[PDB]
Design a binder for these strands. Structure first.
Ligand SMILES: Nc1ncnc2c1ncn2[C@@H]1O[C@H](CSCC[C@H](N)C(=O)O)[C@@H](O)[C@H]1O
Lengths: 239, 321
RNA sequence: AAAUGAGGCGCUGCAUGUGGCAGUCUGCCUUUCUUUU
């Protein structure tokens, strides 16, 4: 009822791609700390981590059964290294070859993929006093296809805490990029609970009013633009 | 005729079930042979099979279906059947004769495998794996061809298709490389490690909390009652709307029942103290659950799951600092 | 621009109504706990 699917998994080493990252522009991503939400199979995450170079990139999801599989997906690109092609059935039941790359204490980071790490947790703590307690530690925050489920599951109120919390996690000069869902088919699935329908009719902000509310000083973003579902750049101010 | 077609199907399925390969794989029909006088079994026992129930429950038509039969003989009445030729030893050349094939299109039938593989050889046995009695094919097959050169013709004919010997050597190499990587990571964990009567009776300490709402997870409840004052136990099976907590002191109990604001106004919860013999029976339930937990045998945990758990926790703690 | 993985069996000894911990060759095995009986 989060709408998450294990399908469309990337077995492929990241030359051939999904195509969302074909749209994205390379300039921000070089050597910058990235927090990225809502990436269950991690295939879009890892493909960013290979082709461009961020220093630290952290994906975050809620389902424990999805983050275990995303750690299997990072183990497959380490198990990437008459040569053998390997029977597909053998890997499925045994698990992939390599170990997880735990670094040394005297270790060098910023090498694929010693950077990336998948942590598990709900994002919204449901308290604005806990929203106020946060500190900035990132430069580029990426969030695709999260507005829909957080909207329908936590009303407007948890979405407002999520916007306020991601403004509390940006360092100044930091960039948030978003490709949110249009209002199009929100109704199509309201009966997963009764609470999901009770929040779908409790919607007090529209996706056209997303870009207004991010410029509203309860969140307080500095300047925003759209260079291409929509493609949006929101900026916290410099320093 | 359709009756003749059903007779041919019965003769086909029974002659496979008295075929050499399928008898050298299956335990059960061999035990039906061996627990018998000269190797016999009732026909109605074979009627109970799942593919046999898809055809015929009439044993008379089945005894007519084995009148033209190559490797079945019937005794007198047409109610018991023999293997015609007695079962010898299991051959070892069938390992060489086999063919492994991956990538099946999730429509797996034995007849589908015979339809694709009868053209190049005489198909003798099929192994197909179902996902834990949920009736789903996994996507790969084990085909038994006969006398080597049919299978070596068929591998040349093509849906990855490779030999069982190649598959077994590939399995040996794969487990050797996984054992090498886990050996190196166990060395890494060794190196970083080298771098660095049960509960007794107090009166009035037990708080029963009933809810009308179905309760969330017990970690949230443990954090909720623990953030106010001292929890010894949060008792909640996942899905119950009524729960308990055991506290350290009656002062802890008196403090939490006087937490009217953050408990009762945030959530419709009845937080009360058990007294009377409710408390006495609840201490009995606590002692019984203690003896049940202590007499419980130990849970099982595999090596790669415990190691991947510990490895991810150390990668989390080393990455965050 | 809508739903499958730790699947099977352990052996230790510290702790244990307390939510396990440290080992066991990655604890072994995986076509397979398996009905095409
Ligand atoms: N409150 C929350 N906290 C953390 N993760 C959440 C969350 N709400 C939703 N999510 C995660 O965000 C995900 C968005 S679904 C998008 C998945 C991605 N497109 C892919 O291909 O894998 C959901 O699966 C859900 O697991």
């Amino acid at each position: 009822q989060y709408g998450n699917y294990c399908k469309y998994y990337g077995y492929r080493n990241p030359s051939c791609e999904d195509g969302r990252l074909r749209v994205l522009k390379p300039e921000w991503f070089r050597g910058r700390d990235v927090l990225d939400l809502g990436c269950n199979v991690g295939h879009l995450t890892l493909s960013i981590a290979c082709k461009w170079g961020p220093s630290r990139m952290v994906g975050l999801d809620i389902d424990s059964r999805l983050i275990h599989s995303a750690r299997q997906n990072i183990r497959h690109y380490l198990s990437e290294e008459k040569r053998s092609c390997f029977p597909a059935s053998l890997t499925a039941s045994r698990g992939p070859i390599a170990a997880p790359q735990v670094p040394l204490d005297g270790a060098d980071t910023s090498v694929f993929p010693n950077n990336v790490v998948f942590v598990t947790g709900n994002y919204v703590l449901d308290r604005d006093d806990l929203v106020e307690a946060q500190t900035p530690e990132y430069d580029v925050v990426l969030c695709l296809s999260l507005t829909k489920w957080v909207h329908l599951n936590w009303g407007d109120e948890g979405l407002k805490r999520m916007f306020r919390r991601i403004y509390r996690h940006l360092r100044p000069g930091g960039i948030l990029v978003l490709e949110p869902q249009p209002w199009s088919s929100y109704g199509k699935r309201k009966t997963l609970t009764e609470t999901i329908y009770k929040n779908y009719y409790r919607i007090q902000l529209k996706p056209e009013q997303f870009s207004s509310y991010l410029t509203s000083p309860d969140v307080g973003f500095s300047s925003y633009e759209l260079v291409a579902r929509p493609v949006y750049l929101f900026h916290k101010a410099r320093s | 005729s359709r009756v003749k077609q059903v007779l041919a199907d019965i003769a086909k399925q029974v002659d496979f079930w008295f075929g050499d390969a399928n008898l050298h794989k299956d335990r059960f029909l061999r035990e039906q042979i061996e627990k018998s006088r000269d190797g016999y079994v009732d026909i109605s026992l074979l009627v109970s099979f799942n593919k046999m129930k898809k055809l015929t429950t009439d044993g008379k038509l089945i005894a007519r279906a084995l009148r033209s039969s190559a490797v079945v003989e019937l005794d007198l009445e047409g109610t018991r059947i023999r293997r015609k030729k007695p079962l010898g030893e299991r051959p070892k050349d069938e390992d060489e004769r086999t063919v492994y094939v991956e990538l099946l299109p999730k429509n797996v039938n034995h007849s589908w495998i015979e339809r694709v593989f009868g053209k190049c050889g005489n198909v003798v046995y099929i192994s197909i794996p179902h996902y834990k009695s949920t009736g789903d094919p996994k996507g790969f097959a084990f085909v038994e061809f006969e006398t080597k050169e049919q299978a070596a013709k068929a591998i040349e004919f093509l849906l990855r298709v490779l030999s069982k010997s190649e598959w077994m050597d590939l399995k040996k190499e794969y487990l050797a490389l996984q054992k090498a990587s886990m050996a190196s990571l166990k060395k890494t964990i060794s190196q970083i490690k080298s771098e660095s009567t049960g509960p007794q009776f107090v009166s009035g300490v037990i708080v029963k909390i009933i809810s009308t709402e179905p309760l969330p997870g017990r970690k949230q409840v443990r954090d909720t009652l623990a953030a106010i004052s001292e929890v010894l136990y949060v008792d909640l099976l996942e899905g119950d709307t009524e729960c308990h907590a055991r506290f350290k002191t009656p002062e802890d109990a008196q403090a939490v029942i006087n937490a009217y604001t953050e408990i009762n106004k945030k959530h419709c919860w009845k937080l009360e103290i058990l007294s009377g013999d409710h408390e006495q029976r609840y201490w009995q339930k606590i002692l019984v659950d203690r003896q049940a937990k202590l007499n419980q045998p130990r849970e099982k945990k595999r090596g790669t799951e415990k190691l991947i758990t510990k490895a991810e926790k150390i990668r989390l703690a080393k990455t965050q600092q």
